[PDB]
């Protein structure tokens, strides 16, 4: 047995009635001095290391050529001056197993944490030495963490894309379905997760050029996409991951949900394709009144009105669709559909739930389009325009397919350094650079929307870690007060950085003038309501850091109106799965699942205590399953009001609660303004 995992297993050996948490420091120390320093390739000087990495196709020469080697040396000194030490064995293990650069035979280790951070910083700065040093300070302090694609591939030659979330709109045509399959395989080949909207596709039993009952529905396209994602699996190390989204008023909604039932046949069930359901407020209203709802055939609506069903307002056109004789509709029970959704989430965790009117009542770019679906992680909520892929000889009408670059602030380290403003602005700059350097040459709509919208996603993690290490319960009102103030400040500084970038570059995102930022309606609650902490305990947490007031928000609103905004979307809180270990942080803003996390890697068993877990804060690290989901919904809704995109909201359910409890949680989330619900995890 390895010495470091033997030391790491001494955490669970209870001495004097307490877990031996200090063993993990010894575990990581042994891990380093027995595996990492031995397996690390060491060079005489940094020049030899950089030459070796560039020559043997490990790095990219173009980005390293913008700095003189003295500047690169200064950046590397800045990284190593911090003398960063991983606080736990899991942090270092995850870094050196997932993100650290290794030789071509996966034998030795080329990059340390400082080397990877310096390379990512030099990639971000794009020739600026001082900016590279600022990025080095930001990441070595672990105040900001670039997403797994960016952190893993920044500055590497044989790399995937820096963006891994893509959202595709599929038009109701065979040419568009073929192009969707092709683009899904191309983006899965790049390593990205692809989400597809299947609402515009006509339902099963619709006509294809005046021959009736000809269309196979969205389930045939679902099978096509599932096999396309199985094919594009990247060696199978990380198999192709796709998501399909359907509006709840689509006629194929029941067959769409039946693809996830355990008793589904092999000719229907999809395995590699996640599913999400978009629920307008009309459906919730119909279920609330116990009235008879109707699902509609999309092609009939398109023929009658000239627009797709999901491109229309259901809360204003549902009655017109029902009364229209030329529109084909099927009678359903909305409460039965809700119960089926709850049962499916209990048994499989699917579908993702998107509350469409919750997304679009605060959506800043409804003039471009309404948000019709989310991503595979169920947190990207941006306007999309469907493309019109025509025959081979004809030109294609390219729409807007969503993609944003992810990045997470570490709430604990940002709050410790009292650097919300600087971290948010530097992270915004880095995400802007990642957006500018991303060029997808096989997804035309993704390319066009990346160039036009310039959308970024700046998330946060370690919310529960910060609260538990500060003696604040996750369900407590003080926690929600802190989240309100913190994320209002993050929104303020992200908007300020976006406006400053627009002023410097002299350009805004496409169709900015129709957005709520341009009209000033976005800033109404910020110029009217003060978001300063209401509790003295929380107010001391922000001591030494300026909290923008209503006057500051009015000044920012004037600044945005006079200079514009560079990013259509700025903030989205992703799950942040594996980078949370490296940053020694709790995953996303969701509460922790286990206080001490037990994992098996190969034939070795190792345990990961939550960051900062001890006996003085053992009960503040309350597990997500033991807490009220209503209070978690309250917390996420408090955070969501400052996030322009969505939050990957996982529901943590006990075995005792029924499907009615899950439905109640979903309805309370819809009532409280939750935009999306990610997973129904059951213990």
């Amino acid at each position: 047995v390895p010495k470091w995992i033997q030391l790491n297993n001494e955490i669970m050996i209870q001495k004097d009635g307490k877990f031996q948490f200090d063993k993990d420091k010894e575990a990581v120390h042994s891990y380093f001095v027995d595996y990492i320093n031995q397996n690390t390739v060491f060079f005489h000087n940094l020049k030899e290391k950089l030459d070796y990495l560039v020559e043997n196709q490990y790095y990219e020469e173009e980005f390293l050529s913008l700095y003189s080697f003295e500047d690169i040396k200064e950046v590397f000194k800045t990284a190593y001056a911090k003398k960063f030490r991983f606080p736990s064995f899991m942090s270092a293990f995850k870094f050196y197993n997932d993100y650290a650069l290794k030789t071509n035979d996966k034998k030795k280790i080329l990059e340390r944490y400082e080397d990877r951070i310096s390379i990512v910083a030099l990639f971000f700065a794009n020739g600026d030495t001082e900016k590279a040093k600022e990025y080095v300070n930001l990441m070595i302090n672990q105040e900001y963490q670039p997403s797994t694609p960016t952190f893993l591939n920044a500055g590497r030659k044989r790399r995937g894309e820096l963006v891994s979330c893509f959202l595709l709109e599929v038009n109701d045509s065979l040419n568009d379905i073929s192009r969707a399959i092709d683009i899904s395989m191309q983006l899965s080949k790049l390593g990205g997760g692809v989400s597809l909207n299947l609402s515009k596709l006509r339902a099963k039993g619709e006509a294809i050029k005046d021959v009736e009952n000809a269309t196979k529905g969205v389930v045939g396209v679902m099978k096509l996409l599932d096999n396309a994602f199985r094919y594009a699996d990247q060696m199978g190390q990380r198999q192709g991951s796709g998501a399909a989204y359907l509006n709840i008023f689509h006629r194929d909604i029941n067959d769409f949900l039946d693809t996830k039932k355990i008793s589904a046949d092999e000719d229907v069930r999809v395995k590699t394709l996640s599913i999400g359901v978009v629920i307008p407020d009309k459906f919730v209203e119909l279920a609330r009144e116990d009235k008879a709802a109707y699902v509609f055939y999309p092609h009939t609506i398109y023929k009658e009105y000239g627009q797709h069903m999901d491109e229309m307002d259901m809360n204003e056109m549902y009655d017109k669709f029902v009364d229209n004789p030329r529109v084909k509709k099927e009678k359903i029970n909305p409460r039965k559909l809700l119960e089926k959704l709850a049962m499916l989430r209990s048994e499989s965790g699917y579908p993702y739930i998107m509350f469409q009117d919750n997304v679009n009542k605060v959506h800043a770019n409804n003039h471009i389009s309404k948000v019709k679906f989310s991503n595979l992680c169920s947190e990207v909520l941006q306007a999309s325009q469907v493309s019109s892929y025509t025959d081979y000889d004809e030109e294609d009408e390219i729409g807007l397919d969503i993609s944003c670059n992810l990045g997470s602030l570490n709430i604990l380290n940002v709050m410790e350094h009292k650097s919300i403003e600087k971290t948010v602005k530097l992270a915004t700059d880095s995400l802007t650079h990642v957006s500018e350097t991303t060029d997808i040459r096989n997804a035309p709509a993704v390319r066009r929307a990346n160039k036009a919208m310039k959308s970024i996603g700046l998330g946060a993690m370690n919310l529960h870690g910060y609260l538990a290490q500060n003696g604040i319960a996750y369900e407590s009102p003080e926690a929600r007060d802190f989240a309100n103030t913190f994320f209002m400040m993050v929104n303020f500084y992200s908007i300020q950085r976006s406006a400053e970038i627009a002023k410097e570059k002299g350009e805004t995102f496409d169709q900015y003038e129709g957005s709520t930022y341009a009209t000033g309606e976005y800033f109404d609650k910020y110029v009217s309501t003060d978001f300063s902490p209401k509790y003295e305990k929380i107010a001391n947490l922000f001591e030494g850091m300026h909290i923008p007031t209503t006057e500051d928000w009015k000044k920012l609103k004037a600044f945005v109106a006079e200079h514009g905004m560079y990013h259509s979307y700025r903030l989205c809180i992703a799950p942040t799965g594996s980078i949370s270990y490296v940053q020694s942080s709790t995953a996303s803003v969701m509460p922790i699942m286990e206080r001490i996390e037990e994992r098996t890697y190969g034939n070795s068993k190792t345990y990961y205590p939550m960051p900062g877990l001890a006996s003085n804060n053992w009960f503040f690290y309350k597990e997500a399953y033991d807490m009220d989901m209503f209070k978690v919904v309250d917390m996420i809704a408090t955070i969501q009001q400052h996030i322009d995109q969505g939050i990957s909201f996982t529901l943590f359910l006990k075995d005792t609660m029924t499907t009615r409890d899950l439905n109640r949680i979903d309805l309370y989330a819809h009532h409280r303004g939750i935009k999306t619900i990610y997973y129904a995890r059951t213990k």
Binding site: V284, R288, E339, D655, R664
Partner: protein, 289 residues
């Protein structure tokens, strides 16, 4: 007082050999000596024969003569396990470990082996001698069935358990443990039915039934000794297996409500180591907060 709990236990124990992947035993099998592989194949073949007849004949015939729909349901379920689950599992093991010719040869070997033919002749003869409405012939067949369940299988079970206990052939061993778990409850259940019939008799008749049971046990025992030597001498284990079958003979007697017949002995410690969410409708008040 007991059928319902046996019904529940039997149905909750339901399994299929396909639930257990067997390719993991491929290497520990390859590594055994030719003598060891030969004994192992033959042992399982002897078990297959016993389960074939218990499923085809023994359990269905007892089911036919026992009164009560619930008692019949338990006996029918046990019959299905014998031939649809147990007997078939051995073929799953054979098909994984052995080439077709070795499989063909071992099934030919069961047909010509005199001890295996004798024990089948004796047990099946008693099953086929049951006369309708004649409780004594039924008792005799139930004694035979208990002896098959709780005694006769054990000369066979020894070897898979012996390997399992050493960390060898553990997937095959998992199947065998599931089979053994079933036979233990089958032997108890049939034992309780036999005791019902025995308890109806005069003291004189009871004395004769004990004589029948003990004479039959001794006759089966003497044959099993020769069978055991024939199989296990080549692997050096005959004396150890003999101790095991005597141990289990006592368990069979106890299942029949009789005192142990053989003295206690130390068994090989290796062999001892070888042993949706609820759907609730939404209320109107659930939509308001």
């Amino acid at each position: 007082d007991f059928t319902q709990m046996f019904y529940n236990q039997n149905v909750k124990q339901f399994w299929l050999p396909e639930e257990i992947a067997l390719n993991g035993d491929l290497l520990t099998w390859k590594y055994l000596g030719k003598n060891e592989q030969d004994t192992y194949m033959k042992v399982l073949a002897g078990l297959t024969l016993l389960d074939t007849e218990q499923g085809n004949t023994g359990m269905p015939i007892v089911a036919e003569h026992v009164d009560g729909h619930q008692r019949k349901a338990v006996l029918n379920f046990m019959a299905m396990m014998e031939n649809a689950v147990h007997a078939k599992s051995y073929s799953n093991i054979f098909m994984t470990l052995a080439p077709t010719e070795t499989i063909n040869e071992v099934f030919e070997w069961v047909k010509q082996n005199k001890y295996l033919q004798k024990k089948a002749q004796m047990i099946v003869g008693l099953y086929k001698a049951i006369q309708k409405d004649d409780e004594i012939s039924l008792f005799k067949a139930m004694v035979a069935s208990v002896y098959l369940e709780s005694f006769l299988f054990y000369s066979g079970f020894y070897y898979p358990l012996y390997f399992y206990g050493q960390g060898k052939l553990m997937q095959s061993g998992e199947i065998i443990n599931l089979i053994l778990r079933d036979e233990a409850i089958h032997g108890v259940y049939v034992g309780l039915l036999a005791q019902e019939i025995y308890n109806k008799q005069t003291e004189e008749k009871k004395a004769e039934l004990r004589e029948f049971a003990i004479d039959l046990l001794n006759q089966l025992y003497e044959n099993e000794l020769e069978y055991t030597e024939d199989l296990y001498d080549q692997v050096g284990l005959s004396h150890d297996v003999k101790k095991f079958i005597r141990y289990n003979a006592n368990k069979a007697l106890m299942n029949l409500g009789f005192d142990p017949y053989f003295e206690e002995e130390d068994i090989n410690p290796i062999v001892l180591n070888g042993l949706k969410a609820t759907v609730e409708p939404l209320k109107d008040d659930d939509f308001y907060f």
